[PDB]
Ligand binder design. Structure first.
Ligand code: HEM
Ligand code: HEM
Ligand code: SF4
Ligand code: SF4
Ligand code: F3S
Ligand code: F3S
Lengths: 295, 160, 172, 296
């Protein structure tokens, strides 16, 4: 049986998402490409270049019109008539619109395609714009993160192939399966958060015991992603586990949400042991000082 | 802090009533809720109210004695006799439970990687391990203690 | 058989504590559960405990009032009202508190039963269906009964904060 | 144009109530289902061809569209008398069933008959009537129980499978979660009365004329999964409880043998609020009336 045609195009990006995709442990990217889909266009990996590459592009979107999946990495710039990103002598947005027109569905890989990511941060010199602001007449599945988790990417692919359907999405267009919950709601350091046990500076005793990174600016409480459960690189680690707080990289405009090392706000926080230690010493001092042994 | 001795009673009852109602639900939790655990902390609040009521309670019990009362082989000569109307042995037992509820209760709260003045409670843990158990038994005996207190409270509501 | 006279006070307190804690959650319900509503009845039990605590409370309160009346007021038609007033501006504001307290309880009963007897109790509850017409005459509906009922509960809780602090002030 | 998905509808031992229910559909009309959503390629009740012409249709469809048609099954096969309690083309019906299921992609088990066994399977099950899933073990079977299922539920399940191009999600029993996920009792508009302890005690009493709960008249709502209390029957006109009879439990396996329909359901928590509080009040009022001496 023939494999579903996939067109993978690149706007302004860092290629982190393509890199993440090939890190997939199960299924291997090798097997995705050979057995599960038909990666018919992808600038990073395809043999053909220039006019040969253009011919492939045209042939696929024509032959399989209405039947291919469009995978989008990066985003189109609106500044300078789109010439901040040039493909075949023309603005990338033209290739984007052309590819979108014949696609049955669009996968927006990473924060770039979903939201804008780093190039869209202040002051957005190129007017980088997320795909869904440009394409409005097609189903778009946002798979945010910078990059998304390798095995999340492949799992979403295998879902759509095996179950022959788009994954259910929130109101933002994120797959519920991996983006339905917050990092903070599946973080193995929540015990410390809830106790009031925090790292206060790098490599302190709290850090060497793997205490919560909330005070170090962890944006876990406001970030939807699967890093605390699925984890990264065959479940080896994730940012918080290796001692850095979540940057919020799966969330819209996270680059402009204040310093990464600034506490997150409007998250309820009231420690169990930090509160009870305080109520204890307040009472004990009121007592010890009355007796006379303040020392 | 030199107010009446009435005040140090009604507090204890308030603490007691809270440490019971809360401690009960740490062990047999309420029905489950559902939402987003970032904005939810129901069990965490229960546990918080507990630990800090256990703080106040402990202080006031450490003080409802030093008020009540007012070498190491000289006190012995006068305590050994109590070791060999019998209506004190109940009121005595009650204060003994409270202290048991504190030793065991803190044994749980303290050994959580705390480095402090809680170092002695560690022995309670080793004791329960020596018993041929683990800290689960501390939880069990703690829970039992709550029932026993409620028994006195149950009984002391005789009228007298 | 019966008991000592202080039983019929500790009861009322027990009833009061229950009618408050339960009635509170009839209006601001606990967080939601989820399961199969055939085997779940949490809200239904709160309402049940409420109505039947309100039964006990009502009985005890009315017998407890009947005796104070028979016994002259307390101590073992607006005249007496206007006179209560002149001597009232001189512990005279503490009696009017205990009186207001028993007046609230009766209001909490007249209103509480107007709600309970609503869905066709059709027997001895016939008078409470003037309370309903009254609130309609007000230009309202039975929702107002709920509102004034909930208010009464807060007002009672006010006395209780006073009456408890005033009593504990007898820690002489 | 567009081809429609081929559907083979076979009949075992049945009352043809399920087929009747199907054509009651208000939205979409059965007419439009047959015309536009599916290709009803075989169905004894409606088809023009009979006899050897009917056999030819059957063979042609399951052979041509092998592996690609949906098999809808109404009724069930009898195992008794070598299956000759139900004879089709001079052979045991079970042979037809097996032959049809072997080429189906998926199977719909219409009604309690196909799902469970229904009335013919009741004590003592003279014919050994057997539900489809006990005979066919290698195919996805979607159970759509009820005697019959709700007309609009039937069509909704069909439209779902056509539109979304997949089977509906099912419980551990194979019933679609969408319509069988909850109990009649959990969406019954008479729960208020149940919960208050306000019951019909005999037919056409004052309770019955006010539409009180039918729990004490034997309503099997508390143990029955179906959509009758929400979706309702015949373009939402009514359902059994609304017209004054308790649920018989007709969507549930072996419901015929669960005692009398007028016998109360068991192991269902039931403590009325107003029934309990009325008792508590009179108990207290009567205790006091005894002590004062105005007893009775
Ligand atoms: C009269 C006093 C007290 C009563 C009635 C009481 C009651 C309870 C009960 C019933 C439990 C449930 C245990 C279980 O089933 O596992 C509990 C848990 C606990 N109590 Fe107490 N308690 C009292 C005093 C204290 C004190 C002084 C402390 C010291 C802080 C304490 C700390 C704890 C802790 C740490 C837990 C369980 C920790 C967890 O949630 O994992 N309690 N208490
Ligand atoms: C001290 C006396 C009482 C207190 C403090 C009390 C408290 C409350 C409160 C706060 C509510 C909730 C109101 C709302 O937000 O909607 C409530 C509801 C109610 N109370 Fe009371 N109540 C008292 C006496 C009574 C009595 C004597 C009855 C008579 C049976 C009664 C019957 C009701 C009823 C029927 C409801 C509403 C039931 C419903 O529709 O869910 N209450 N009560
Ligand atoms: S704030 Fe960060 S480190 Fe702390 S529990 Fe939440 S996600 Fe984990
Ligand atoms: S027992 Fe029957 S009539 Fe009563 S609420 Fe339940 S389903 Fe409805
Ligand atoms: S930084 Fe990104 S990788 Fe996960 S842990 Fe935060 S969403
Ligand atoms: S009898 Fe059957 S029709 Fe519905 S109301 Fe009960 S499941």
């Amino acid at each position: 049986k023939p494999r579903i045609p996939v067109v993978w195009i690149h706007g302004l990006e860092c290629t982190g998402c393509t890199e993440s995709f090939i890190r997939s442990a199960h299924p291997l990217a090798k097997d995705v490409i050979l057995s599960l889909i038909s990666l018919d266009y992808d600038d990073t990996l395809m043999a053909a270049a220039g006019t040969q590459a253009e011919e492939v592009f045209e042939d696929i979107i024509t032959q399989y019109n209405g039947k291919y999946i469009l995978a989008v990495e990066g985003n189109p710039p609106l500044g300078e008539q789109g010439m901040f990103c040039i493909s075949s002598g023309r603005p990338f947005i033209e290739k984007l619109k052309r590819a979108a027109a014949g696609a049955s569905a669009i996968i927006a890989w990473g924060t770039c395609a979903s939201w804008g990511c780093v190039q869209a941060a202040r002051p957005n010199p190129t007017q980088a714009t997320p795909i869904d602001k440009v394409i409005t007449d097609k189903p778009i599945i946002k798979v945010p993160g910078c990059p998304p988790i390798p095995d999340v990417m492949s799992a979403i692919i295998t879902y759509m192939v095996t179950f022959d359907r788009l994954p259910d999405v929130d109101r933002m267009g994120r797959p519920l399966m991996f983006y339905g919950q917050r990092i903070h709601d599946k973080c193995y350091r929540r015990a410390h958060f809830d106790a009031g046990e925090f790292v206060q500076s790098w490599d302190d005793d709290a850090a060497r015991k793997g205490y919560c990174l909330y005070k170090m600016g962890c944006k876990g409480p406001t970030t939807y992603n699967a890093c605390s459960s699925t984890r990264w690189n065959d479940g080896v680690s994730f940012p918080i586990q290796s001692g850095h707080g979540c940057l919020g990289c799966a969330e819209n405009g996270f680059w402009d949400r204040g310093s990464f090392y600034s506490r997150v706000v409007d998250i309820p926080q009231m420690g169990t042991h930090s509160t009870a230690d305080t109520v204890g010493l307040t009472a004990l001092g009121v007592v010890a000082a009355a007796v006379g042994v303040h020392a | 802090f030199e107010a009446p001795v009435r005040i140090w009673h009604w507090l204890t009852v308030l603490c007691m009533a809270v440490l019971m109602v809360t401690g009960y639900f740490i062990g047999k939790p309420l029905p489950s809720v559902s939402g987003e655990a970032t904005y939810l902390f129901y069990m965490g609040y229960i546990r918080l109210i507990h630990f800090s009521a256990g703080m106040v309670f402990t202080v006031v019990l450490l003080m409802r004695i030093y008020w009540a009362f007012v070498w190491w082989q000289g006190v012995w000569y006068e305590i050994r006799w109590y070791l060999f109307p019998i209506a004190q042995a109940a009121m005595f037992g009650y204060f003994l439970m409270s202290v048991f509820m504190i030793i065991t209760g803190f044994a749980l709260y303290s050994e959580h990687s705390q480095y402090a003045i809680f170092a002695p409670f560690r022995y309670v843990v080793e004791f329960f391990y020596w018993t041929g158990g683990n800290s689960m038994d501390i939880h069990s005996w703690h829970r039992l203690g709550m029932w026993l207190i409620g028994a006195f409270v149950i009984g002391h509501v005789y009228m007298a």
